[PDB]
Write a protein that binds this ligand. Structure first.
Ligand SMILES: OC[C@H]1O[C@@H](O[C@H]2[C@H](O)[C@@H](O)[C@H](O[C@H]3[C@H](O)[C@@H](O)[C@H](O)O[C@@H]3CO)O[C@@H]2CO)[C@H](O)[C@@H](O)[C@@H]1O
Ligand SMILES: OC[C@H]1O[C@@H](O[C@H]2[C@H](O)[C@@H](O)[C@H](O[C@H]3[C@H](O)[C@@H](O)[C@H](O)O[C@@H]3CO)O[C@@H]2CO)[C@H](O)[C@@H](O)[C@@H]1O
Length: 210
């Protein structure tokens, strides 16, 4: 199918981080304010007052080679819902921008009220907090515009160390692509992605392996 992308990092607990969202073995892991994995899936999101659960820093993209990367995204898929997309993995083939022709496999770990139809909001530290700002409470805040985040690669140099790799990826593998278009199909989640979130759908084994 065809989709549109944006970029984000708001530090909030991901929506597929709650139990009862989808038919999975366990929800996506959340972390404490110091980027360390916690196991209380009922823990209050850090984007809410008195919350303690934030997005883990390892739920960020990385390059496997110059034409292939792995990562995560907040999704809104037409005709579906959180029960259908939480923890599902999708292979995106970019169709526009400087990354046209490259592919990336992402695991869907959340969604947003502002997402349109077939809209993938890629997890990218420095890509913009958007509606909620959980990074201020978590560690003091991230630089950049509310929507769109930072604009230069050297601005990644002052990020908390755990968020640096994801920040640099944006300018390195991704070439600072500005909301590139893509084609997508559902795939079985690579073991590398489930190792970071802990979350695998019961129906994962029905889709093609990458
Ligand atoms: O039902 C479980 C718990 O839900 C809590 O609300 C969360 C929503 O379930 C979840 O959809 C939403 O997700 C946010 C996400 O954190 C944010 O990063 C993204 O930009 O937007 C999403 C959609 O708004 O988070 C909320 C808040 O944590 C209830 O608060 C809780 O009582 C309930 O048990
Ligand atoms: O709301 C969804 C997510 O949006 C992310 O910001 C995007 C803006 O929503 C999107 O409108 C903006 O698009 C720009 C584009 O980058 C710019 O070059 C063009 O000239 O103008 C467009 C319209 O303003 O792009 C950003 C970045 O993807 C938020 O960063 C994210 O938190 C939020 O969930």
């Amino acid at each position: 199918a065809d989709g549109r992308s944006t970029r984000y990092w708001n530090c909030c607990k991901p929506s597929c981080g709650w139990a009862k969202k989808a038919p999975v073995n366990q929800p996506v892991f959340s972390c404490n304010a110091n980027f360390q994995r916690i196991t209380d899936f009922d823990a209050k999101s850090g984007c809410e007052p008195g919350g303690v659960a934030y997005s883990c820093a390892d739920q960020t993209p990385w390059a496997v080679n110059d034409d292939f990367a792995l990562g995560f995204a907040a999704t809104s898929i037409a005709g579906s819902n959180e029960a259908g997309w939480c923890c599902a993995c999708y292979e995106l083939t970019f169709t526009s921008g400087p990354v046209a022709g490259k592919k990336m496999v992402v695991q869907s770990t959340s969604t947003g009220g502002d997402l349109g139809s077939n809209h993938f909001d890629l997890n990218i530290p420095g890509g913009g907090v958007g509606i909620f700002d959980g990074c201020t409470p978590q560690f003091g805040g991230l630089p950049g515009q509310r929507y769109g985040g930072i604009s230069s690669r050297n601005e990644c140099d002052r990020f908390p160390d755990a968020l640096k790799p994801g920040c640099y990826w944006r300018f390195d593998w991704f070439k600072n692509a500005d909301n590139p278009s893509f084609s997508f199909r559902q795939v079985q989640c690579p073991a590398e992605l489930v190792a970071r979130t802990g979350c695998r759908r019961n129906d994962d084994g029905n889709f093609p392996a990458v």
